[PDB]
């Protein structure tokens, strides 16, 4: 209505700034080609200072020289014209942080693209913040319940444990962190903030239609009330795609330094490396391996180091990071991923053939591992999955061994049958997260060989059948697993009886 004209006219009153508009920055643009611009003047400019051109496009002054300063653009060069007037902000590049960012969808600069008006920001924060030192940290001791079966079973995640999701094109990578965010609805509907866990998804270099459908889907399952989307789509400039994950990392630091717990998801760092080498080659800087500048390790390094678990002295904040790396044909020896593997605290490899067999999630257990996840696994899951990874590696040993058609003893054929049941067990449809109380009895049935008499095709209906069985009947045991997160011997035997009851069908 006219209330937008009211708000815009109050902003016209601010437009008061003209009465104190004596900028000590303005200088002419010498040249501006190939995503860069040399500007004369600006003799009190700062290093990595945000400036704004006369055509409204902002920029970061990245390299300072006696004579000129090279400023990168934050958009197309079609708007910037030679010889114009370049006002400096007066600031190193900062972004809005605050709670009102939840639900909104912004650019790399916090300017919202959802069309939902301005941003209720609680402050501005620099992009290239130092990562915290070794002393205000703590080893992770709190779980991140992703809701997926084999993820929460085999590779548990601590609050702040930097875990890589690596895979290939169209291999179910995005759906993993997506359903993790959807699992976080359990406690974001709750009330304890230390149980709560806030979600920031960083879509860079991707299709705007894809991001729109993702935001749509997060509104359908109502994850949006705790979600923050950072869009750096492929139409936009390479420095925006370079810059945006640092900004979202600053947002995660805003949540972490408030004592709260937060989750950031990078998707993908691969295109960020493409944008960064696009920058560096347009900086005329020499490349190294696979035409990348040698600091690209330092790039994703200095990005991902700003994510850990704060100690109690800092208020016990945490920030967990989920990077995504698209590789080329299952290669794990390209220069870009081998850098990331040297940074993150573990790997979640998605084999293309397993999803080609429709096994979704397509987890290669033999490659995927976490380093310190076992310290923060759910204690019941830590009780019930000790033999599980051993048995699955055992079944993997006889997986390639059984292809020759040779008959075997009852031990290895037993492991073959039970590992087939466990393999067909851990499939899980999209948008179907599972609580820990739900994940425990499937593991307890899978360990104790009860699935062996069941048909291999019958396992999928058996899962939902036994779950609805327990939710109908042994709902008290579900509450016990919820409250304790730890199975006593009495809970163990009651669980055994409750299983073997429905195992009789």
């Amino acid at each position: 209505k006219a209330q937008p004209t009211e708000v815009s006219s109050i902003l016209e009153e601010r437009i008061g700034v003209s009465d104190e508009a004596n900028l000590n920055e303005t200088g002419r643009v010498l040249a501006v080609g190939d995503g860069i611009a040399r500007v004369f003047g600006l003799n009190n400019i700062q290093a990595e200072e945000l400036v704004e051109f006369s055509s409204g496009v902002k920029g970061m002054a990245l390299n300072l020289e006696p004579g000129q300063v090279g400023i990168v653009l934050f958009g197309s060069d079609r708007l910037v014209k030679e010889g114009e007037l370049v006002k400096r902000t007066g600031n190193i590049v900062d972004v809005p942080v605050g709670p009102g960012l939840l639900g909104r969808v912004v650019d790399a600069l916090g300017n919202p693209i959802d069309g939902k008006g301005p941003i209720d920001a609680a402050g501005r924060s620099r992009a290239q913040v130092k990562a915290p030192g070794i002393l205000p940290r703590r080893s992770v001791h709190e779980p991140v319940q992703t809701g997926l079966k084999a993820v929460d079973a085999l590779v548990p995640i601590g609050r702040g444990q930097r875990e890589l999701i690596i895979g290939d094109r169209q291999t179910g990578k995005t759906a993993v962190a997506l359903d993790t965010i959807l699992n976080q609805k359990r406690w974001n509907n709750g009330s304890d903030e230390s149980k709560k866990l806030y979600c920031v998804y960083v879509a860079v270099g991707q299709k705007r239609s894809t991001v729109a459908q993702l935001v749509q889907t997060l509104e359908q399952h109502d994850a949006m009330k705790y979600s923050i989307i950072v869009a750096a789509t492929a139409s936009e400039a390479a420095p925006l795609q370079y810059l945006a994950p640092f900004t979202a990392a600053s947002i995660g630091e805003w949540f972490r330094d408030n004592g709260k717990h937060a989750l950031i998801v990078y998707d993908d760092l691969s295109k960020q490396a493409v944008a960064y080498r696009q920058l560096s080659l347009l900086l005329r800087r020499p490349p190294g391996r696979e035409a990348y500048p040698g600091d690209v390790f330092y790039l994703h390094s200095r990005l991902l180091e700003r994510a850990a678990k704060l100690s109690e002295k800092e208020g016990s904040g945490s920030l967990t990071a989920l990077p995504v790396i698209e590789t080329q044909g299952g290669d794990v020896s390209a220069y870009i991923p081998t850098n990331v593997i040297s940074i993150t605290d573990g790997q979640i490899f998605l084999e293309a053939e397993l999803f080609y067999k429709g096994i979704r999630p397509a987890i290669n257990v033999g490659l995927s591992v976490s380093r310190v996840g076992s310290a923060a696994q759910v204690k019941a899951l830590k009780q019930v999955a000790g033999s599980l990874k051993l048995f699955l590696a055992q079944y993997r040993e006889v997986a390639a061994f059984a292809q020759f058609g040779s008959d075997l003893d009852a031990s290895t054929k037993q492991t073959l049958v039970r590992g087939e049941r466990l393999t067909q067990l851990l499939k899980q449809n999209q948008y179907s997260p599972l609580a820990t109380e739900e994940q425990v009895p499937l593991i307890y049935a899978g360990v104790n060989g009860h699935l062996d008499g069941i048909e291999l095709s019958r396992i999928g209906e058996f899962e939902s059948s036994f779950l609805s069985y327990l939710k109908s009947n042994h709902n008290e045991l579900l509450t016990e697993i919820r409250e304790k997160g730890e199975l006593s011997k009495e809970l163990l035997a009651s669980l055994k009886s409750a299983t073997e009851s429905f195992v009789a069908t």
Binding site: R137, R285, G294, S301, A308, S342, V372
Partner: protein, 472 residues
């Protein structure tokens, strides 16, 4: 007198300081600049002429203005040394970042010192028993020597270092310096947790280790000098104290990478692959200060990252020239669950001579390498045809070699959270007799799986008994 300079160019972590006073500070001296964040340290890289030098930053250079005042400190970056530095977490500048007060040392020595000369060299064949099977068999470690851990991405390097430290540093008697260069901040924190909980760091009492850190978050000029900081601290105790110094470096490749990232901005033509032209020289000036003099003994262990498992990369290939005992971790060996994933062939030592390790040890290791080389030769025919199209002598050899490979793997007390299995500190002579009996084929009846992830040969007997009683 203050020799005031002016900022003229800022490019990343490379900054240019003009002077009007003709008394320019010499190369490798320490400049500093008062920031609103405190102070910032520069190191004099090169005189560019015109009373104007080019310098490398020890910190992030954000928010700096051309013409900002630049203050000179005269000399290089002097680091506090001595027993005061024990159990202190020291910055590259020399700042204690444990917030346990300042390092109240007597002496602060500059990092850029000359390597010991040829007359000061000292040779030694003091074999260090590690308890680790493949080390104590295939590449023995010399006390006072230099030890390399060539490894790809995340294939157990840091875990192997922690295993070595847990095995050695308590039963050492001298002193130890760890230096986390470009690693994970979490890894340094967890190591600090261990050093407290092992009591190697005694916070109120006396420790024996000194911690020099600075991680992959840190800008490269900080990473390009942290090794020199830990180096100066180590060689102080080698010279002033005359003790036995355990120098653990992780990761030495990060140093050369820090030398690579700035060199394009230091005006150099890019050299080979993407590295700097001053690779082997800086590598040499780093390594030649890591030595064992007549005054003291420095036993150093250095992890070496391998870029994308390319051993023909110039940085690890250059690193091979500086090491006494190579140890190479393959990802493919780790993919067989073989921990540690040491390549049995490619590990070498200046040790392992029959007049050094004993003749029998040399013979056993010789036959092991022959057997595994035979297996690796037959690997392609195994891949095409399998074990059926072998001759029976070759088939027996392949069987015994694959028993040996699983026998090589060893349970770690450090990686117990990955295994649930207690660590195995396996003695040397028992390992020799174990591989002796395996080469003699006394346990060919025992299946291959009972060799996997085992201690001594008695533990293979025990595991075969368990498999006989359980698999039945």
């Amino acid at each position: 007198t203050p020799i005031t300079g002016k900022v003229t160019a800022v490019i990343g972590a490379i900054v240019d300081v003009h002077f009007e006073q003709s008394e320019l500070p010499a190369i490798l001296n320490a400049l500093e600049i008062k920031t609103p964040q405190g102070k910032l340290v520069l190191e004099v890289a090169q005189h560019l002429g015109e009373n104007t030098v080019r310098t490398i930053a020890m910190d992030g250079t954000e928010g700096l203005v051309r013409g900002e005042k630049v203050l000179d400190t005269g000399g290089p970056i002097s680091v506090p040394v001595g027993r005061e530095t024990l159990g202190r977490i020291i910055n590259v500048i020399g700042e204690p970042i444990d917030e346990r007060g300042p390092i109240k040392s007597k002496l602060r020595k500059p990092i850029h010192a000359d390597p010991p000369s040829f007359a000061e060299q000292s040779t030694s064949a003091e074999i260090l028993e590690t308890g680790i099977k493949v080390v104590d068999l295939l590449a023995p470690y010399a006390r006072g020597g230099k030890i390399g851990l060539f490894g790809g991405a995340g294939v157990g390097k840091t875990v192997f270092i922690q295993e070595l430290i847990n095995n050695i540093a308590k039963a050492h008697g001298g002193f130890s310096v760890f230096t986390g260069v470009g690693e994970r901040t979490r890894e340094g924190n967890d190591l600090y947790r261990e050093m407290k909980e092992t009591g190697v760091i005694n916070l109120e009492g006396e420790s024996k280790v000194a911690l020099v850190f600075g991680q992959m978050n840190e800008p490269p000029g900080a990473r390009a000098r942290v090794a020199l900081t830990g180096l100066t601290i180590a060689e102080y105790f080698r010279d002033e104290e005359g003790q036995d110094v355990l120098l653990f470096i992780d990761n030495i490749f990060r140093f050369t990478q820090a030398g690579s990232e700035v060199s394009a901005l230091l005006g150099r033509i890019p050299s080979a692959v993407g590295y700097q032209p001053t690779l082997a020289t800086d590598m040499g000036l780093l390594q030649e200060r890591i030595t064992t003099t007549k005054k003291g003994s420095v036993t150093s262990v250095q992890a070496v990252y391998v870029p994308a498992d390319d051993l023909t990369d110039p940085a690890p290939a250059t690193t091979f020239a500086h090491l006494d005992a190579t140890t190479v971790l393959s990802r493919g060996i780790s993919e067989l669950g073989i921990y540690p994933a040491v390549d049995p062939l490619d590990s070498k030592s200046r040790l392992l001579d029959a007049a050094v390790v004993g003749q029998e040890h040399y013979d056993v290791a010789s036959k092991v390498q022959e057997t595994l080389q035979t297996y690796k030769s037959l690997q392609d025919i195994i891949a095409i045809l399998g074990m059926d199209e072998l001759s029976e002598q070759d088939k027996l050899t392949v069987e015994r070699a694959r028993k040996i490979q699983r026998f090589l793997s060893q349970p770690f007390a450090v990686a117990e959270v990955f295994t649930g299995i207690p660590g195995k500190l396996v003695r040397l002579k028992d390992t020799v007799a174990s591989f002796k009996a395996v080469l003699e084929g006394k346990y060919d009846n025992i299946p291959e799986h009972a060799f996997y992830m085992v201690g001594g040969i008695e533990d293979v007997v025990a595991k075969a008994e368990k498999l006989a009683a359980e698999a039945n």
